[PDB]
Amino acid sequence: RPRFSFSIAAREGKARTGTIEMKRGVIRTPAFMPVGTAATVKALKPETVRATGADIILGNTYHLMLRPGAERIAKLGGLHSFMGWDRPILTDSGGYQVMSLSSLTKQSEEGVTFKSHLDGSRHMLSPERSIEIQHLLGSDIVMAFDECTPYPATPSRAASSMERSMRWAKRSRDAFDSRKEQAENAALFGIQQGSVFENLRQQSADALAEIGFDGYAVGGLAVGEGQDEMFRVLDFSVPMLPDDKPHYLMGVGKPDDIVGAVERGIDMFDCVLTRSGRNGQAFTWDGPINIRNARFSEDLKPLDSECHCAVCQKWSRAYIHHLIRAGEILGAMLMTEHNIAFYQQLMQKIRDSISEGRFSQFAQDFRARYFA
Amino acid sequence: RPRFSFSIAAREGKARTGTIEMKRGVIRTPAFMPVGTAATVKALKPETVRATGADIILGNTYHLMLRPGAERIAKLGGLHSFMGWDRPILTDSGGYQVMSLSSLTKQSEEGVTFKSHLDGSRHMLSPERSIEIQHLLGSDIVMAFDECTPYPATPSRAASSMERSMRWAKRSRDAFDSRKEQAENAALFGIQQGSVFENLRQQSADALAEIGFDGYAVGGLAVGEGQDEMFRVLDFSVPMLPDDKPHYLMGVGKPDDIVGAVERGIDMFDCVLTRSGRNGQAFTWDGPINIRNARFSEDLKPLDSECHCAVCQKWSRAYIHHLIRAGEILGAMLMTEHNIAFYQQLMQKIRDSISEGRFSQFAQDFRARYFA
Numbered sequence: 201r202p203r204f205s206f207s208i209a210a211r212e213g214k215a216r217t218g219t220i221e222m223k224r225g226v227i228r229t230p231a232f233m234p235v236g237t238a239a240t241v242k243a244l245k246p247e248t249v250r251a252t253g254a255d256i257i258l259g260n261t262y263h264l265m266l267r268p269g270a271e272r273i274a275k276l277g278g279l280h281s282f283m284g285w286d287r288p289i290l291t292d293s294g295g296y297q298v299m300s301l302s303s304l305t306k307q308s309e310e311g312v313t314f315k316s317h318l319d320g321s322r323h324m325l326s327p328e329r330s331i332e333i334q335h336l337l338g339s340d341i342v343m344a345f346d347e348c349t350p351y352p353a354t355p356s357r358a359a360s361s362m363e364r365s366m367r368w369a370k371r372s373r374d375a376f377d378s379r380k381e382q383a384e385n386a387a388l389f390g391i392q393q394g395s396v397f398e399n400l401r402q403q404s405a406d407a408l409a410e411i412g413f414d415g416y417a418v419g420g421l422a423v424g425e426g427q428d429e430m431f432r433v434l435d436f437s438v439p440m441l442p443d444d445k446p447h448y449l450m451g452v453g454k455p456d457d458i459v460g461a462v463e464r465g466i467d468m469f470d471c472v473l474t475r476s477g478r479n480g481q482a483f484t485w486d487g488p489i490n491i492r493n494a495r496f497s498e499d500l501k502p503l504d505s506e507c508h509c510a511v512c513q514k515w516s517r518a519y520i521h522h523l524i525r526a527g528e529i530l531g532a533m534l535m536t537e538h539n540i541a542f543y544q545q546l547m548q549k550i551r552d553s554i555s556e557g558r559f560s561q562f563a564q565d566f567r568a569r570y571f572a
Numbered sequence: 573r574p575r576f577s578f579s580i581a582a583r584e585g586k587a588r589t590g591t592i593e594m595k596r597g598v599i600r601t602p603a604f605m606p607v608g609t610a611a612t613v614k615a616l617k618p619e620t621v622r623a624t625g626a627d628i629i630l631g632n633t634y635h636l637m638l639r640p641g642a643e644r645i646a647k648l649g650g651l652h653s654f655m656g657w658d659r660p661i662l663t664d665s666g667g668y669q670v671m672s673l674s675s676l677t678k679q680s681e682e683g684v685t686f687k688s689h690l691d692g693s694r695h696m697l698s699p700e701r702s703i704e705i706q707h708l709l710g711s712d713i714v715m716a717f718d719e720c721t722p723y724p725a726t727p728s729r730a731a732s733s734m735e736r737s738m739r740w741a742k743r744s745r746d747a748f749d750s751r752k753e754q755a756e757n758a759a760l761f762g763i764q765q766g767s768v769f770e771n772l773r774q775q776s777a778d779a780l781a782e783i784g785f786d787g788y789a790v791g792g793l794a795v796g797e798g799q800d801e802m803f804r805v806l807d808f809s810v811p812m813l814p815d816d817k818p819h820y821l822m823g824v825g826k827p828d829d830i831v832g833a834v835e836r837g838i839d840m841f842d843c844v845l846t847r848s849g850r851n852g853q854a855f856t857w858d859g860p861i862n863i864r865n866a867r868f869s870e871d872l873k874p875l876d877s878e879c880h881c882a883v884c885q886k887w888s889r890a891y892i893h894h895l896i897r898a899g900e901i902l903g904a905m906l907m908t909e910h911n912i913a914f915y916q917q918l919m920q921k922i923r924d925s926i927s928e929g930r931f932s933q934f935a936q937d938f939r940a941r942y943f944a
């Protein structure tokens with residue numbers, strides 16, 4: 201098996217379907233990656249994650265470096281061994297969660313120092329340390345460490361963080377290449393920045409292509425801009441990236457965001473789905489429902505009428521309504537398994553429709569029903 | 573399949589091993605029943621409960637009557653259908669949890685009225701209503717509704733509650749027999765009371781045998797008396813019950829309590845295992861451990877070195893330590909699956925040793941290692 205081979209089997213418009221072959225397995229694209237936070241995909245055994253159809257999961261570097269610790273995971277044999285998932289794992293860089301979750305952050309050209317949200321202990325990330333942590337975890341796809349740009353951003357601030365991010369992309373590339381075992385067995389993705397600005401997006405794409413990566417994320421989106429703007433930025437941004445490498449839209453998203461992003465050339469996705477009753481949200485082909493709603497208390501139908509998942513085979517809305525209202529762990533288990541299965545079924549339908557040259561029709565039909 | 577047939581295949585001293593055949597399946601005895609509270613065995617799918625070796629689970633009437641409601645469960649097809657467990661279910665009467673968990677209880681010869689601990693709504697239980705709720709749930713083994721005696725109890729108070737409980741046992745018997753579908757398909761167990769007093773235990777056994785039940789619980793124990801006293805009371809109490817019916821020790825218990833209770837003629841057990849870090853307790857053949865302890869943070873061995881469960885096949889102490897410390901749902905899932913599997917392996921070893929005429933040796937060996 202190669203370290204990394206992305207092959208495009210079929211195209212329709214800007215959409216593509218294909219495979220990434222890696223040492224630990226094949227990833228079918230477009231792909232949805234369930235998110236493992238602290239070395240677990242919430243409420244699911246790895247076998248259950250695989251049973252939903254997932255080919256790859258995401259691990260959060262920030263959480264892992266705090267608990268149990270990167271060096272500790274390495275001592276124990278790496279993240280795959282530790283958590284019992286033997287297929288590919290993509291790790292993020294840790295940078296975003298430092299900005300969103302940690303306190304007392306000091307930022308400079310060298311990286312960021314910060315206080316853990318768990319115990320106030322002091323930590324550091326930098327391009328070099330982020331790549332090192334991802335090496336210690338043993339992940340298969342490594343994300344370059346960048347500097348996030350908040351939305352909204354002025355052109356000056358967006359340029360500055362894009363420029364810094366490109367300097368850090370080169371540092372990430374060299375750090376990754378400096379470690380033989382990592383360079384030979386893992387892949388490295390760069391992240392395009394530039395906020396909503398076409399010229400900065402172009403400069404960033406050119407800088408990243410000059411350095412050269414195995415894949416390219418469109419960074420800096422899904423941070424408050426809303427779908428119309430996100431799509432507008434994707435419209436000009438994705439074509440700037442190398443066509444022959446995967447395009448990853450980090451942290452996206454709701455089913456309709458995924459479909460529209462695939463229409464715009466995105467191949468990979470991840471997101472986590474719980475505040476204010478939101479743990480009760482279940483995806484259906486007729487749109488989301490909140491299973492906590494009293495209207496489900498006696499509803500004997502499955503979460504979704506067509507879903508092939510094990511939860512829909514075995515349990516009713518009424519039961520899952522009860523479990524979630526009662527705060528039972530099994531409620532979280534069942535809801536998560538169904539929702540991730542639903543996402544994987546969505547991705548399968550997207551892949552099949554692109555392969556069959558009927559993705560535009562699929563997208564129209566999907567929207568007409570999902571938003572009816 | 574018969575409604576109920578208890579057969580004793582082998583004996584050693586006061587210990588017995590055998591089977592209860594019921595319409596929904598066979599229960600191997602001595603049996604451990606995992607506890608389903610609000611229509612779920614915590615953190616486990618029913619298939620996983622079965623995979624541990626469980627033949628029957630317990631459902632808590634008090635919790636079920638409050639949420640989702642007994643009538644609602646009946647409308648939805650009964651508890652087995654609702655939660656997806658198709659084997660036997662024993663339901664308790666609800667009386668104990670009314671006393672332990674509810675507020676504003678008023679007690680009389682007719683039953684008990686009480687305020688729900690969930691929302692302060694007013695409810696009632698009585699022999700008749702308890703039997704009716706257990707009918708609406710569709711359980712296979714129904715417990716007579718009794719009046720619990722706190723420990724310690726004076727002889728007068730223990731006699732009064734025993735006498736009331738025997739009157740309520742007769743009411744429970746007649747209520748159960750009044751409902752054709754229940755009488756034909758389910759079994760009814762009576763509960764011996766009398767606190768620590770031999771004469772009251774004898775009167776209670778005689779009253780229950782006169783009424784006639786399918787099985788007999790030794791009630792009123794594991795309520796603070798400690799193991800020596802519990803065993804002392806079992807020593808004289810169990811032989812008073814009909815030999816040819818199952819003997820159930822409700823809410824017991826720790827592995828050593830189970831072994832000693834089987835030595836004294838008990839055939840059935842249940843208990844729930846979480847306060848003050850106790851969710852971290854894992855059973856091993858070398859005694860319990862608390863997986864939260866820092867000594868496990870890098871321990872690559874499974875929870876128990878010999879356990880056949882799926883958790884011990886796949887994950888280390890170090891990983892489960894991390895999950896529990898991190899408050900992850902998967903930690904609760906794995907710990908519960910291992911602990912219930914451990915209990916079922918204990919019961920299998922007990923059954924096999926009695927069948928092979930070497931239970932006394934097994935008990936000695938078990939204790940010498942478990943308490944080393």
Ligand SMILES: [Zn+2]
Nearest residue numbers: 507509512538
């Ligand atoms: Zn489903």
Ligand SMILES: [Zn+2]
Nearest residue numbers: 879881884910
């Ligand atoms: Zn185990």
